[PDB]
A paper describes a structure:
Canonical prokaryotic type I CRISPR-Cas adaptive immune systems contain a multicomponent effector complex called Cascade, which degrades large stretches of DNA via Cas3 helicase-nuclease activity. Recently, a highly precise subtype I-F1 CRISPR-Cas system (HNH-Cascade) was found that lacks Cas3, the absence of which is compensated for by the insertion of an HNH endonuclease domain in the Cas8 Cascade component. Here, we describe the cryo-EM structure of Selenomonas sp. HNH-Cascade (SsCascade) in complex with target DNA and characterize its mechanism of action. The Cascade scaffold is complemented by the HNH domain, creating a ring-like structure in which the unwound target DNA is precisely cleaved.
We determined the cryo-EM structure of target DNA-bound SsCascade containing Cas5/6/7/8 proteins and a processed crRNA at 3.48Å resolution (Map A). The head part is capped by Cas6 binding to the crRNA 3′-hairpin region. The trunk runs along the crRNA spacer region supported by six Cas7 molecules (Cas7.1–7.6). The tail part consists of a Cas5-Cas8 heterodimer which accommodates the crRNA 5′-handle region and the PAM-containing DNA duplex. Starting from the PAM-proximal region, an 18-nt target strand DNA base-pairing with crRNA and a 2-nt non-target strand DNA are observed in the density map, while the remaining DNA part of a putative R-loop and the cleavage sites-containing DNA duplex are disordered. The C-terminal HNH domain of Cas8 is located between the head and tail parts and is clearly observed in Map A, the head-focused refinement map, but not in Map B, the overall refinement map. The PAM-containing DNA duplex is surrounded by a positively charged vise consisting of the Cas8 N-terminal domain, Cas5 thumb, and Cas7.6 fingers. The N2 of the dG(−2) nucleotide in the target strand is recognized by Asp82Cas8, explaining the second C preference in the 5′-NCN-3′ PAM. The SsCascade HNH, consisting of an anti-parallel β-sheet (β1–2) and surrounding three ɑ-helices (ɑ1–3), folds into a canonical ββɑ-metal structural motif with the conserved functional residues His304Cas8, Asn318Cas8, and His327Cas8. The apical part of the HNH, especially ɑ1, ɑ3, and β1–2, has extensive contacts with the ɑ-helix (ɑ2) in the C-terminal RNA-binding domain of Cas6, while the HNH side and base are supported by the Cas7.1 web and Cas7.6 palm.
Numbering used by the authors:
A (entry chain G): 1 to 340
B (entry chain A): 11 to 335
C (entry chain B): 11 to 334
D (entry chain H): 3 to 255
Write the structure that this text describes.
Amino acid sequence: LRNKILAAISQKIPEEQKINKYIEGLFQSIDKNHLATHVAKFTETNSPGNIGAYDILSSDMNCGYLDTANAGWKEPDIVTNDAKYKRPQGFVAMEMSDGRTVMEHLQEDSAELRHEMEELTDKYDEIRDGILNMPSMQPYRTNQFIKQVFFPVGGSYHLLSILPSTVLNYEVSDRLYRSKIPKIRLRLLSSNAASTTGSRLVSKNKWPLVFQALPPKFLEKNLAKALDKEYLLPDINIDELEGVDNGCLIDEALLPLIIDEGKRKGEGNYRPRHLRDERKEETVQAFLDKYGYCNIPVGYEVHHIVPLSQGGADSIKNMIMLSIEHHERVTEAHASYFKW
Amino acid sequence: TLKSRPENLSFARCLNTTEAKFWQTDFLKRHTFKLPLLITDKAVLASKGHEMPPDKLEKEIMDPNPQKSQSCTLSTECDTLRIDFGIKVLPVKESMYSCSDYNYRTAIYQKIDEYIAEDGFLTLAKRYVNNIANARFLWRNRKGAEIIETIVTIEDKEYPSFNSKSFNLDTFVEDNATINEIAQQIADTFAGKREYLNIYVTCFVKIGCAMEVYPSQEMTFDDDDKGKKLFKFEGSAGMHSQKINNALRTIDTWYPDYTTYEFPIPVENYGAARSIGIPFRPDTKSFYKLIDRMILKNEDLPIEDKHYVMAILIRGGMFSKKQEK
Amino acid sequence: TLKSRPENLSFARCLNTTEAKFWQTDFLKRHTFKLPLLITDKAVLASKGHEMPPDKLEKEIMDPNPQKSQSCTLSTECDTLRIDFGIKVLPVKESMYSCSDYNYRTAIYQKIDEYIAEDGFLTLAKRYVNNIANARFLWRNRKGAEIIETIVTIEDKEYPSFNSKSFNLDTFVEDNATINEIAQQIADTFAGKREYLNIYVTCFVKIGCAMEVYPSQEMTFDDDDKGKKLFKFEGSAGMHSQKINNALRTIDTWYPDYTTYEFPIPVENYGAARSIGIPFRPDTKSFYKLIDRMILKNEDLPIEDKHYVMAILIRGGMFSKKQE
Amino acid sequence: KGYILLEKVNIENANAFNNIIVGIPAITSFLGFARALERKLNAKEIAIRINGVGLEFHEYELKGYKNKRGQYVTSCPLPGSIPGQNEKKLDAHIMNQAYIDLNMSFLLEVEGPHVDMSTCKSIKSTMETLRIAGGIIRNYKKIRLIDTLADIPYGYFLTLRQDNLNDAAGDDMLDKMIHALQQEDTLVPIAVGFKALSEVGHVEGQRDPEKDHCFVESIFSLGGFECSKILEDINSCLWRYKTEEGLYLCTII
DNA sequence: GCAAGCGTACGGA
DNA sequence: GGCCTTATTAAATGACTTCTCCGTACGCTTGC
């Protein structure tokens, strides 16, 4: 089995040279790769070099919060700066005849793996030692591409650099694949982009599942909610109606038009009180200013051509000023039509 | 002297634009009447007509091909598309959200003050206002309309309706009085004579009854639905904010080949313009080389190159030193 | 110079077409009177009449078969169907939606200008206007109508109506005055001598009282309702814009086998007709090889191949070439 | 002390993606916004300080659509030129991201000598220059002082739920979250803060070369929604900063 | 003469 | 206060588009 898998990946070269090529690239690549749990290149592939951390801690299992210390991630991640050193991550992930990983068989130094590898190379002891003694990835620098965030401490500010976590991303993406929780799949990374993050787990987990932390469903925006916050205006213009002057209805004869405009706009557009426009004194004042009044003239009242309860906006374009008796007549007609 | 750029120069975008809703109306009632415009699902059966190698072609050529799609159409009763969108302008100097070298920060502030003395920001502000006046933000929706009106509202003052169809998209107009006034307001905002400015734009396009309308596509990746998905904004059709902004950023006619390419392009660090397969500013004219020459070498660049550099500062972006291991 | 067709190349639809809305009417009153035509839900008890292998057949042959459906039918008072839809013609030269090589853009503009010198767009425009006059967009609704009257309106000028029964679908008429007057405006629009042209048409089909009407059916993708769903536009029945545009595109009589079939096919990249399952232009005269021969090889194609090429540019499409 | 409400602010394209979570931004995003508002006011010598924040949701729209299977699919903007070795090419790499639009009202708990309508007008003139979680403030109804829980307009506050998380089935902390969410459908996970992955120091490349620096992992927890008509103590929704020897935490006290 | 810019394999659940 | 019907059946044949979304050392070539 294993020799066929090794052969199957190594290009199209004749048999003996292609196996030796794979072992040569493997042995060269081991020193370039590191053991880690956080990977700066996961948020942005352009940050140069290895930046990441290997969090050993386990204490916080009932502190009321989740992190890579107090969640049981099972698989250690392996990371490189460059995809052309990535081969050991594939080599280690191969399954032997028992279906267990080369990692397990290496940790056991199992006689099966020793026999398999010694039939292909004498370097097996050094390959095993290198793989098992990979250094931990240590942060040593920062870049424009890492997310850098100020956090207040006692009126001073610390400068946090946020590293994403790959062990948790793999673990959560696994466990949500097998649970009913509301979840979203991110499907954005290409295979090439995922490879250049240089992680093993990110190459396995290029399209992760993640928690859908959204408000209650009734608070989703919809057209019904949106139309409830857009307001009606009348179609007539009080600056052009013969029988209106200085914003005041001067002719009685137009009253059926104002009534009909209110009816025609109002039908079915009821707004409950908490959603209605507030009648604002600023609007009435600006209306009076447009026509040069200091105050509402004696015996007149300012009316909304479309009632505010039936969708009308509190705006100059919706106001008209009526005499008290005409105001009463229009109010009575609208109350009769809308069943107030 | 300044050796090199700082490790973390970053500029926030100075000319912010919001998502636009579409509404539909009848042109003669447009001032008072509006109805929602809905994105409608429209699944489609195709023939297979894409370019195929001949050994595959003879197997595939006659097959039918279903495809999912979405499309947007005015009602049979309305005839005019309506767009409403907002803009917010912020001062250039105060938008520099980070810089890790106080010497460089001093130098860049000094050069911006020099530019405010040379121009304020009026020439750029004119070109941005002209791209509002051109109704270039309509993109494909401009390709045919009987009448177009653009109404610009600044802090509840309403300016007169531009007949936006009268402008040639290749030519910027210096002398329209309303463009000049709004451009002065914007230039005052960029120079820091005000801390902010809100501009609300309404635009009306009289297309015709039941004619098609083009909101921007979403970009989404899904296993099944490769079909066209349009941008629903609060259930009504809308335009992505970035596409309107990219319409406004088409001020640039200063790139070196311009005598052979008489059209303007989007302001970009290397003059990359997605309609043409080659960046218009590789090498010596690219933004990095110009700003380095202006600040590290203190050369007095010609005014066109200051226009371009300051236009990229208005664009905003991430401008650090080339990072190292 | 030009090594290959660009990384990206797209042409916008030049003969933009609206959805079509159905109405119902009585033919004598038709200028004054229209009612909505609705789509009625149905469900239907079929028989298992499909072809079955014998071991299945002898077990299920007699079973009933209930099915979901929808249908559209005129009222018991009206007797004519009415179709309203619009067209919006755009310039062909300014239709090129994306490119990746300014040399290629210059070359294609040069070839369109050369075509506008060799000919108008008139010879295509007359065929599109013929397919309006032919009432091909009726599709199944054309079968067995008594009289068909098509009215073309261009920005509040109404042209004298077409008696669409009189046109043999296999022939395109060159000398009808109304067809030529509409086609001149379309040709002026395609050449870029005008910025746009909105054409609205009203088509009256006298079917018969209470008879069935055939809107375009909806596509479904293994949806839980597998049964026939019909297209509703603004609640009344309608036709997809795609199906009307396809009816109008049936102008092509330049494919090579034409003298043995003598009927026009839809303008298509390979000339894949759907009513007949053999493609009429694979290989040597497929669109890709003709446009590449016209531009990359700069060869002066015969005028009928230029007609076909320009008809595909009118259709619009994606012609991007992958670069190795 | 006093309480200022920023009423029904509309946010476009808030940064919705965290390493484990898509949706509601990190709590630190909102509290950092409040701190930025404090710094802007203080630079004008208004001398206000803002000790805590209450977050009330009114509407949301995740940039995306629902599959027929009900799951959301997240939208991206087409990326522009990204700095680094490949920046010249017209096509640029697509990284993990998601964006959400929010309609939200912010309660602020305030110290100051002149907490009044003038400092509300100063907030009004200040807030136009800021962002929320990288999102753009399109509009807001009003800024006002408030005195009682009857003043807040109807909406839903977001509050911490450490109790439900600790009381969950005890196999593992991620299993505690999973079981809690599977038992209590109204609760949601949230990013709460940061854990130091390395001791405080200075390193090359800092945003500022002169403020002490840490590498950190995001801390997550479980939270839940409470109607403002059902709140009893105003303090039950006021998120505040806390620091503990290498934990950087938002919390409610 | 010395350092910056560019074409290219390299690698992979 | 009692109850909400028993059987039979859920089709066939074809199709699910093409394009872009990769960082890097290695060393060879051009510019200062």
